[PDB]
Each structure stands twice: as structure tokens, then as C-alpha cells.
């Protein structure tokens, strides 16, 4: 019987429970975006603005329901409207992480029909971060 | 496309989006104050009280609308009523910054007819500050 550790085991939504995605698996996800005609876009945030928090609620009456700070991240340039080339996306991931090596970066895609983010996963985590565990250390 | 950085890019209201003001440009702003017969005044604050915050709202009911801590700074001596000599203003800037070398210091001017501050900009930021960017690094 293994115990799921509650210490330094932060997650990051979709795919964060799978082993770190290889560049080949990331390329596959990108092809998925293009194959479906979705709009690629990158977002990033410094460590202190990475996970949901409740700081702003100090200014609220009884209306904190479904309100959290840090859900919004910073947009990298603009959504890649029209983009039909997976290589363009992969290069922007590099451009973004190059500009902000010490920030969390996630790749997302928008569907303008349902008008909602249709996919997304973390592509970069600050190398100095130690608030998460590798697949082999999630349970003890 | 250049990306406006969200990291350590704090601003300070009027003129903070321009290149740092030279002593000549600062003197010109002072002449502007005197030429219009406005009342010069210096204000300062330690780093921890330089930017607006919500700390006191913890004591509030649902009345935080337009209430923020740290808007008020500390007055250096008194407003220079009757000042018609810009040199006088420049000397107080030197005296204030000398007395509080590690504090944020801003120059403002009052209009007693409309009874409101009619101008103002930062004249000193502690050398220890690492939450701002030089003009050429506001975007990457």
C-alpha cells in the first residue's frame, strides 16, 4: 500500500499526472491543435502568480464564490490566428521560454465556435521549482 | 512583436512611462509649477508603504470601494506656500532625499482654487528596489 504524498506535490491540470511529456508527445499535441483548426496561444506567469489564491477576497462582501486570483496568466504576444503550421507553434514555445526562463508557461488552444479554451497543458516550469514530484515520487 | 513584461515592472503614475527625467527636465517641471503659481510640496515613504494595498480592508464590512492603503505618503516639512523660486524647490528635494536616502520621494504641487493636486512625479526610488524596469527593458 503506497501513500500519496501531500508534500511538494503541486499539479498543473491536464496531463500533469502523466510522466513529463517528451518533445515528441508535445509535437503530437500540437498536430492535434492544427488538425482541428484550433487557435494556438501561449501564456506565462512568475512563480508567485502561478497557482490560484484568495488575496483579493479581502475586499469582498459574501461574493467569493468561484472567484480566485491567478487564473489569468500573461499572454505571450497574441493568439496564433490562422496558424496551420505546427513548427510555428513549437518555435514560439522556444521564443517565450527564452524571454521568460524563470516563469511557468502553458500552451493552450481556443475554439472560436464554442468560444472556450479547448485544450492546454504546462510546457515550462521554472527549473528552480521544488514544489512538485516526479512520477516515481508521487507516492511513498 | 515585443511583449510587455509583467515581471518587476512597477510604475509610478505620471511620467513613469517616459525615460528617466534628467535634472534639466525635472527643473523644467519645477518652472512649470512656479509659472502657474501652484504650491510645491514633497512627499516620501519607505518601500513597504510605496504602493497601494488592501491590508486595512480586513476590518471592513462591504465598504472597500475606492479605499486603498498607502495613497497617503509622509509630508516633507510643509507645502511651500508663496514659493516663487524654483531653486528653493530643488534645494528641498536635495534636503529631503539626503534625510531619507532609502525612501521613495515624489514632488507634487497643489492648486488651492480647485483644491486638488495638479501635478506630480517620482524624484527618488531606493537604490535597493528591484521591482522596476529600465525604459529599454519594459518589453522583451
Amino acid at each position: 500500500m503506497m501513500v500519496w504524498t501531500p508534500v511538494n506535490n503541486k499539479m498543473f491540470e491536464t496531463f500533469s499526472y502523466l510522466p513529463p511529456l517528451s518533445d515528441e508527445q508535445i509535437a503530437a499535441q500540437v498536430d492535434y491543435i492544427v488538425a482541428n483548426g484550433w487557435i494556438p496561444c501561449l501564456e506565462f506567469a512568475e512563480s508567485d502568480k502561478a497557482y490560484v489564491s484568495n488575496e483579493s477576497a479581502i475586499r469582498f462582501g459574501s461574493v467569493s464564490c468561484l472567484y480566485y486570483d491567478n487564473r489569468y496568466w500573461t499572454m505571450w504576444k497574441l493568439p496564433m490566428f490562422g496558424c496551420r503550421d505546427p513548427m510555428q507553434v513549437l518555435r514560439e514555445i522556444v521564443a517565450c521560454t527564452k524571454a521568460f526562463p524563470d516563469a511557468y508557461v502553458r500552451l493552450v488552444a481556443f475554439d472560436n465556435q464554442k468560444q472556450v479554451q479547448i485544450m492546454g497543458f504546462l510546457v515550462q516550469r521554472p527549473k528552480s521549482a521544488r514544489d512538485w514530484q516526479p512520477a516515481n515520487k508521487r507516492s511513498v | 512583436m515585443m511583449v510587455w513584461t509583467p515581471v518587476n515592472n512597477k510604475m509610478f503614475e505620471t511620467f513613469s512611462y517616459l525615460p528617466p527625467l534628467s535634472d534639466e527636465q525635472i527643473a523644467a517641471q519645477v518652472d512649470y509649477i512656479v509659472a502657474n503659481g501652484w504650491i510645491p510640496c514633497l512627499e516620501f515613504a519607505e518601500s513597504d508603504k510605496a504602493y497601494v494595498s488592501n491590508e486595512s480592508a480586513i476590518r471592513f464590512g462591504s465598504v472597500s470601494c475606492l479605499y486603498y492603503d498607502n495613497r497617503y505618503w509622509t509630508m516633507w516639512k510643509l507645502p511651500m506656500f508663496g514659493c516663487r523660486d524654483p531653486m528653493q524647490v530643488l534645494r528641498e528635494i536635495v534636503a529631503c532625499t539626503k534625510a531619507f536616502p532609502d525612501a521613495y520621494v515624489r514632488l507634487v504641487a497643489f492648486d488651492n482654487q480647485k483644491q486638488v493636486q495638479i501635478m506630480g512625479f517620482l524624484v527618488q526610488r531606493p537604490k535597493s528596489a528591484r521591482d522596476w524596469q529600465p525604459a529599454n527593458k519594459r518589453s522583451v
Partner: protein, 465 residues
């Protein structure tokens, strides 16, 4: 021209085969089984009459108004393939007959008394065409799929839920304890069982508070937004509202309501409260099978689903197809579309009798729950896609290592199937392989797979097209 007392055939007034339906008419498809000797036309006319403007004998008052304007009309009758005494009677109802925004009123007319008529042996309402002009009179769901995902900041995969067990008997603190362990392992939500309201072994306010501590502890620990559908279902509206208010005051994200056992009137009020206060509303369909299980009599779930979308609900259980409760694949895919989409074309192969235009009313998140486990993940993702919430109650608290490991196992199975699909893999064919591969690096999943590997639910389907 004048009033003539006495009884006459309903068909003389209510069977109008040449009527051209209007785009504002509410249409109904009834699976009708007449008593021997009763012409299908007369039976269909009786249904239309007694669910709209007529009664058993001629009344003089008809002359004060315009029956042509208000009468329901049986405008078409088709024999049911393979049935000697079964027909699909189509009835058109003018929009003027319904109270704006009241599902209660719509049901009162259409299914109020006609199902008990001696002249018929059985009757089942298969579908309803809700016209845009009527859809627009409803507030509808508090938020809907897109807004829900935006508030939770969750995208790219199905959501994961879990019903706490045992159903009843747990104390408030033990409930919160179970919830915390469940959520911390990877599940997005946990929930009160449908029958968990307020009882001697656990009063509601005690549960709400401990669950709140659990939600926030799990959220802080994982870094992902968490929730637990706190049950507002109650004996009175006053009690229902007190519970919703408490959830609001605790700042929690979601509550639930058993719309059928609580009732449409109470449900609509709660949905409106949730819209005005920002609470997600999970809808449990308790009691639905009492009404929608049999093919010959009752109301098909697709109608109960449309009704809920109108009354209001962010989530609605849709069945699992492969779980412990019945749910034939084709009709399920049919009403799932009716629940989520803006426009669904007529498709009899899926039980969709009328083209349905939702005119932008928010879509409802389908919830697959009941007797499912890790080995069902491939099929579940294949059937529902990302816009659904898959819940594993026993499938989580039944894991040999506890709630957290059980939650991680389901979260892992889901993400592995989601990844595989995105890569172009055929879940219907490679499902097993995807799960087995995940087992190689996930001991939590491996443990779950071994426990339920031989468990499946395959029985003859009662609710067949």
C-alpha cells in the same frame, strides 16, 4: 355555429392531419397504445384534446373564445415498426397555451391527465420540440459548460467526480475526511450522495463546514481548483434556500439538487439563485427511471433532460452506458447532444424525433456516473469526449490503498486516454493497451486495474428505440 350539448368524437375537433405546424408551436411525439376498438385517430385526438382545451362532452363556453387558435392538434400518426397496436401520435400546441419560463406548466398540460385515460392502455412521451420563442422565456442554466470551465480554469479533458460512500451513515467530519482524501488525489469534484440531505447521523450545516475545510485543504495542496457538490435538496424551499445561502457564505463553488424529487418549481428557483450568486448547480436525476425505463409507458429521459436544461442546471447525469445503470448507446449519444448542443437535427436512429434549436441557451454538462471503473475509461472518453464529468464513487473509495490513491488512478487513466485520443489512437480498439501502458509507471492505476479487471455490466436493454 351554435352550441349543441352532448358527447361527440374528439377527432371531429382534434384530429387535423392537414395542419401546417407553426415555428412557435411546441410539438409532442407520443408512443400511443389504444384500447381495442378505439381508432388511432380518436385516441390521438383524445390525447391532444385533454392536454390542451377539451373535455369529454361539448361545453358552450368554447364559443366565447377561438378554439381554432388555442386547441392542441394531433396532426400526424405513424405506425410503430414491429408493433400491431402502437402508434406515434404527433401533437402541436400553440405557444399561447404555456406559461413563460415554467417547465411545471408545460408538463402539466402535455403529461397532466392523458396517461390515465381508460381509452388507452399505454402512453409514452418520446420527444418535445421546444421552439426558440419558448426557449427564450427561460433563464435556463446558471452558467453552462463554457462558463463552468472558465470559472474552474479547467480545459482539455473530462472532469472527474466521485460520490462519497457509504451512501448514508457517515458523520459530518468523516464525510469531510473522505472528501479531502478523494480530492487531493486528482479528482476535480466529490459530492453528497443524492439522498444525503440532513439526517440524525449527519446534519447538513455540520457537513457543509467540514467539507469546506476539505475542499480548501485539497485545493491548497494540489494547486488545482476543487469542489464538492453540497446537497441543497430539502423538504421545503425555505430549507433548500438556507443551504444554498450557507454555500454562498462559505465561498464554495458548487451545490447540487435532485430536480425530480425536489420538483421543477423548487429547481427553477434554485437555478435562478445560483445565477444571481455565482454558484455552479449540479443536477441529480433521482427517480427518473421510475418514469423513463419502460418503452411502452412514461416519458423518455431525453424529454426529462430538455426539461432540466430549461428549468436550469449546469450538470445533469446522463448515464454511463457501460455502468451498473441502464443506458443504451445510441439514445444516450442522442440526448447528450440535446443536452450540450445549440442545434440538433432530427435523427430517429438516436431517438431524436424533432430538430431542436436551443437558440443559444447554455449547454448542460453531462455526468457519467454509476458502477464504472478504470477499465471503462477508454469507452467513456470515446463516448462523451471532453465535455463531461466522469464520477467514480465505489471506483475511488473502493481502491485497496484508499481515496487518494484511488483518485490518482482515475485521474491517470483519464489523462492517458485523453493523451492517446489526441494522438489519433482509436480508444475503441486500443483502450486496453493505453491502460496497460499507464500501469507500467502508475502503481496506483495498476492496483485499481487488478481489483476490477473482470468487472463488467452487460444486460438486456429495456429502453430500446
Amino acid at each position: 355555429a351554435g352550441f349543441k350539448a352532448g358527447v361527440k368524437d374528439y377527432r371531429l375537433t382534434y384530429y387535423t392531419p392537414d395542419y401546417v405546424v407553426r415555428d412557435t408551436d411546441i410539438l409532442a411525439a407520443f408512443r400511443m397504445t389504444p384500447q381495442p376498438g378505439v381508432p388511432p385517430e380518436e385516441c390521438g385526438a383524445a390525447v391532444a384534446a385533454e392536454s390542451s382545451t377539451g373535455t369529454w362532452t361539448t361545453v358552450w363556453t368554447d364559443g366565447l373564445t377561438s378554439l381554432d387558435r388555442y386547441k392542441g392538434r394531433c396532426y400526424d400518426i405513424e405506425p410503430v415498426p414491429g408493433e400491431d397496436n402502437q402508434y406515434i401520435a404527433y401533437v402541436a400546441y400553440p405557444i399561447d397555451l404555456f406559461e413563460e419560463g415554467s417547465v411545471t406548466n408545460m408538463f402539466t398540460s402535455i403529461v397532466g391527465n392523458v396517461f390515465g385515460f381508460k381509452a388507452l392502455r399505454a402512453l409514452r412521451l418520446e420527444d418535445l420540440r421546444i421552439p426558440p420563442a419558448y426557449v427564450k422565456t427561460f433563464v435556463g442554466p446558471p452558467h453552462g459548460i463554457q462558463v463552468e470551465r472558465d470559472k474552474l480554469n479547467k480545459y482539455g479533458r473530462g472532469l472527474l467526480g466521485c460520490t462519497i460512500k457509504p451512501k448514508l451513515g457517515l458523520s459530518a467530519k468523516n464525510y469531510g475526511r473522505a472528501v479531502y482524501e478523494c480530492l487531493r488525489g486528482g479528482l476535480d469534484f466529490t459530492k453528497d450522495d443524492e439522498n444525503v440531505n440532513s439526517q440524525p447521523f449527519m446534519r447538513w450545516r455540520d457537513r457543509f463546514l467540514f467539507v469546506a475545510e476539505a475542499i480548501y485543504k485539497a485545493q491548497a495542496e494540489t494547486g488545482e481548483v476543487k469542489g464538492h457538490y453540497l446537497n441543497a435538496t430539502a423538504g421545503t424551499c425555505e430549507e433548500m434556500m438556507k443551504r444554498a445561502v450557507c454555500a454562498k457564505e462559505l465561498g464554495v463553488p458548487i451545490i447540487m439538487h435532485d430536480y425530480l424529487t425536489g420538483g421543477f418549481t423548487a429547481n427553477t428557483s434554485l437555478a435562478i439563485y445560483c445565477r444571481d450568486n455565482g454558484l455552479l448547480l449540479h443536477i441529480h436525476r433521482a427517480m427518473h427511471a421510475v418514469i423513463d425505463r419502460q418503452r411502452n409507458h412514461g416519458i423518455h429521459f431525453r424529454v426529462l433532460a430538455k426539461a432540466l436544461r430549461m428549468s436550469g442546471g449546469d450538470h445533469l447525469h446522463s448515464g454511463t452506458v457501460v455502468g451498473k445503470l441502464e443506458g443504451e448507446r445510441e439514445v444516450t449519444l442522442g440526448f447528450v447532444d440535446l443536452m450540450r448542443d445549440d442545434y440538433v437535427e432530427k435523427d430517429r436512429s438516436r431517438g431524436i424525433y424533432f430538430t431542436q434549436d436551443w437558440c443559444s441557451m447554455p449547454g448542460v454538462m453531462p455526468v457519467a456516473s454509476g458502477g464504472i471503473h478504470v477499465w471503462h475509461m477508454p469507452a467513456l472518453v470515446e463516448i462523451f469526449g471532453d465535455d463531461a464529468c466522469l464520477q467514480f464513487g465505489g471506483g475511488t473509495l473502493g481502491h485497496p490503498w484508499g481515496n487518494a490513491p484511488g483518485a490518482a488512478a482515475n485521474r491517470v487513466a483519464l489523462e492517458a486516454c485523453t493523451q492517446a485520443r489526441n494522438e489519433g489512437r482509436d480508444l475503441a480498439r486500443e483502450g486496453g493497451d493505453v491502460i496497460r501502458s499507464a500501469c507500467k509507471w502508475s502503481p496506483e492505476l495498476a492496483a485499481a486495474c487488478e481489483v476490477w479487471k473482470e468487472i463488467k455490466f452487460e444486460f438486456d436493454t429495456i429502453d430500446k428505440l
